[PDB]
């Protein structure tokens, strides 16, 4: 079962605060670290053949871009570094194929935004 | 056995990322790493803990404000982050508190040298 998690993280220099957590990929509601008890197990979404598209589309809305990996780097960061996406396999599957798929889609979505400037 | 790893990730140049070897302090790109998830880990001991935190602090890595099990530390500019893991599912909460503690001591020290 492959999964996907979307994290947020930033630093507020005014308050000297690290502000991180997970965005629930169903409700799209952010959940801070303070409210998360077992972090490594929290906020994952089962990645399916149908929801892949929807996950990539929402990540593109946050400015998450293809990661340039030809290999097994399973992380995608937003341009402002406020968010990132993470892919995992709970049975040690070779993720190269899903990473390729995600990168193609994110890169397609980035070029549609560039084009949609008319 | 606990281990730590220092990653970098950055857009200012198009995106790049990699691992910084915690001995050699030398950067290694994604392009050059086969099995990224198993790459660049350093065993954490009482002997090196201090040196690791001092280098992290050099990069602006600060305490993560966690009162629990968040095992990551980011730099203010978000260019780097440190990660802690166990290979034996060891509970990490106390080591996280020691790293947080050490990065705050180092931040206080830095703020004191910022008053001439």
SS3 of residue A39 by DSSP: helix
Answer whether B61's CB lies under 8 Å from B103's CB: yes
3-state helix, strand, coil in chain A (%, to 5): 30, 30, 40
For this entry, resolution in Å reads: 2.3
The residues, any chain, with a CB within 8 Å of residue B72's CB and separated by 6 or more, are: B64, B81, B82, B83, B84
SS3 of residue A64 by DSSP: strand
Please give, one letter per residue, the 3-state secondary structure of chain B.
CEEEEEEEEECCCCCEEEEECCCCCCEEEHHHCCCHHHCCCEECCCCCHHHHHHHHHHCCECCCCCCCCCCEEEECCCCEEEEEEECCCCCCHHHHHHHHHHHHHHHHHHHHHCCC
Answer whether A58's CB lies under 8 Å from A25's CB: yes
Helix (H) or strand (E) holding A21: strand A17-23
B57's tokens: 């602090």
Q: A59 exposed, middle or buried (CB, 10 Å; 0-12, 13-18, 19+)?
A: buried
Of A13, A71, A81, the CB nearest to B34: A71
The experimental technique behind this entry is X-ray
CA atoms within 13 A on the CB side of B89: 0
Decide if B36 and A9 are in contact by the 8 Å CB cutoff: no
Decide if B30 and A71 are in contact by the 8 Å CB cutoff: yes
Helix axis angle for B93-113 and B49-58, nearest 10°, is: 50
CA dist A14 and A79 (Å) reads 22
For residue A34, which residues of chain B lie inside 8 Å, CB to CB? 67
**Interface probe, candidates A18, A35, A41, chain B, greatest B C-beta count within 10 A:** A18
For residue B63, which residues of chain A lie inside 8 Å, CB to CB? 18
Q: Which residue of B has its CA nearest to A38?
A: B69
CA dist A118 and A110 (Å) reads 15
The residues, any chain, with a CB within 8 Å of residue B32's CB and separated by 6 or more, are: B18
Q: Which residues of A touch B (CB under 8 A)?
A: 9-11, 13, 17-18, 20, 33-34, 36-40, 65, 67-69, 71-75, 77, 79, 81-82
Cα separation values, B110 from B54, B65, B114, B116, Å = 11, 18, 6, 11
Q: How far is B21 from chain A (nearest CA, A)?
A: 17
For residue A79, which residues of chain B lie inside 8 Å, CB to CB? 11, 15
SS3 of residue A51 by DSSP: helix
Answer whether B100's CB lies under 8 Å from B7's CB: no
CA dist A35 and A32 (Å) reads 6
The answer to whether the Cα torsion of B40, B65, B106, B59 is positive or negative is positive
Helix axis angle for A51-61 and A96-115, nearest 10°, is: 50
Helix (H) or strand (E) holding A17: strand A17-23
SS3 of residue A1 by DSSP: coil
Decide if B17 and A81 are in contact by the 8 Å CB cutoff: no
CA dist B113 and B116 (Å) reads 6
Decide if A20 and B70 are in contact by the 8 Å CB cutoff: yes
Cα separation values, A7 from A19, A47, A85, B28, B72, Å = 11, 16, 6, 24, 12
CA atoms within 13 A on the CB side of A35: 11
End-to-end CA distance of chain A: 41
Distance of CA A51 to the CA centre of its chain: 13
**Interface probe, candidates B15, B34, B81, chain A, greatest A C-beta count within 10 A:** B15
A105 sits in the region (left: phi over 0; alpha: psi -120 to 50; else beta) called alpha
Decide if B71 and A37 are in contact by the 8 Å CB cutoff: no
Pairing of strands B42-43, A75-77: unpaired
B3's tokens: 């281990």
CA dist A30 and A97 (Å) reads 29
Q: Which residue of A has its CA nearest to B81?
A: A9
The residues, any chain, with a CB within 8 Å of residue A82's CB and separated by 6 or more, are: A8, A9, A10, A62, A63, B78
């Amino acid at each position: 079962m492959m999964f996907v998690r979307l994290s947020y993280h930033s630093f507020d220099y005014l308050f000297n605060l690290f502000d991180a957590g997970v965005i629930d990929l169903n409700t799209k509601c952010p959940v801070s670290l303070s409210e998360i008890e077992d972090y490594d197990n929290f906020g994952w979404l089962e990645l399916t053949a149908e929801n892949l598209e929807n996950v990539c589309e929402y990540c593109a809305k946050l400015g998450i871009e293809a990661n340039g990996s030809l290999g097994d780097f399973r992380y995608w960061y937003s341009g402002d570094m406020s968010y990132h996406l993470e892919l995992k396999s709970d049975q040690s599957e070779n993720l190269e194929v899903k990473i390729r798929e995600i990168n193609l889609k994110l890169k397609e979505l980035e070029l549609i935004k560039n084009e949609c400037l008319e």
